């Protein structure tokens, strides 16, 4: 069955950069997309970025001009590298896998995640 | 773009619970909202899809449906299973982004 | 005779190239055999039924 | 003048190949871009000795 | 003479197969060339020194 497990968390000062890791299995890696989806304390979900086979990326207004997020489809791996963090990233960041098959550039028309991981913290504070 | 959900909704065992999730034309009307359930501090858990369909092994208590510009989760026969928080998702084909709402906690009387 | 061999053992598959970007593939296949004595010389007409 | 090679092993050897992760990189984009990415050329081994 | 072409575009690569698995690769390239008229019809000698 589907597995995905996180990993990369760790608390940073407030204009600190941090790299977020998951490990994939049990499926074909390189037909379905994989997204960062973070929950504030006590808020709700939201959506970070996700990237699709080909390393086409999407972000959030939030991050796009911020984050970075990339695969690597021989390793079965998806990374999320943040830069000029501020005290709001502050949020337990989901690993997902997409129920739908897209590759190339035209995704982010339909997106549903199927599968979770378990969840990395990142704290951001003095 | 967000989307809007109740704060809360209550309901007592074997009735009938429903959720509803609004947006617009840009989100909800031309991609329906997929549901999801969090038991507190796990791990969320995807329920109905956007076309109504439901993942391997999710009982035919959970449907949704969507008319316009918003949707509607119904949990028909509430169990004590079903003491949760659930949140509805739709993605912007626009821009391109994905949009989750801001969450419902569901009370069993 | 009955110590003389009576072949040669070849695996050798031979891609020769001919005119016209056309190759001749010789596949060579080579195998030692054993053949046990049937359970019984005679011819059977057996039914299943599951 | 190139020569044709020859299969000398039980297993195959490394191949140029287009795949999921490569795949945009030989066809252009919505707006005419194009690129050429760099290709390896001494795919199969050879025994030195 | 003014109205008439002196070549033709080809840009195909050719594999002509030959005896004894030996491919004899033509390959053809053609360019649209811009040249501009040099900043100096002089020679010059240029000494750069970073």
Redesign the interface.
Same mark, same amino acid.
């Given at each position: 069955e589907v597995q995905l497990v996180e990993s990369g968390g760790d608390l940073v000062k407030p204009a600190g950069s941090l790299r977020l890791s998951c490990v994939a299995s049990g499926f074909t890696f390189s037909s379905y997309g994989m997204n960062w989806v973070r929950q504030a304390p006590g808020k709700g979900l939201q959506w970070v970025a996700g990237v699709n086979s080909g390393g086409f990326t999407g972000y959030a207004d939030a991050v796009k001009g911020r984050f970075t997020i990339s695969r690597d489809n021989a390793k079965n791996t998806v990374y999320l590298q943040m830069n000029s963090l501020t005290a709001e990233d502050t949020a337990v960041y989901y690993c997902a896998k997409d129920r739908y098959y897209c590759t190339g550039d035209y995704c982010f028309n339909l997106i549903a995640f199927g599968y979770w991981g378990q969840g990395t913290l990142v704290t951001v504070s003095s | 773009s967000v989307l809007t959900q109740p704060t809360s909704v209550s309901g007592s065992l074997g009735q009938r619970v429903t959720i509803s999730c609004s947006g617009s034309t840009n989100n909800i009307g031309i991609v329906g909202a997929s549901w999801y359930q969090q038991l507190p501090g796990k791990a969320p858990k995807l329920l109905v899809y956007s076309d109504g369909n439901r993942p391997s092994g999710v009982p035919d208590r959970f449907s949704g449906s969507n008319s316009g510009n918003s949707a509607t989760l119904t949990i028909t026969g509430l169990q004590a299973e079903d003491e949760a928080d659930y949140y509805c998702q739709s993605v912007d084909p626009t821009l391109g982004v994905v949009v989750f709402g801001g969450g419902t906690h569901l009370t069993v009387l | 005779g009955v110590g003389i061999s009576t072949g040669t053992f070849n695996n050798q598959?031979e !891609?020769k !190239?001919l005119?016209?970007?056309?190759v001749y593939i010789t596949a060579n296949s080579s195998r030692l055999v054993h053949l046990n004595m049937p359970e019984s010389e005679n011819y059977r007409r057996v039914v299943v039924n599951n | 003048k190139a020569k044709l090679r020859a299969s000398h092993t039980w297993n195959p050897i490394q191949q140029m190949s287009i795949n999921v992760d490569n795949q945009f990189n030989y066809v252009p984009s919505n707006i005419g871009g194009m690129k050429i990415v760099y290709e390896k050329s001494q795919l199969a081994p050879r025994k030195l000795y």
């Open positions: - | - | 598959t !891609f !190239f005119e016209n970007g056309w | -």
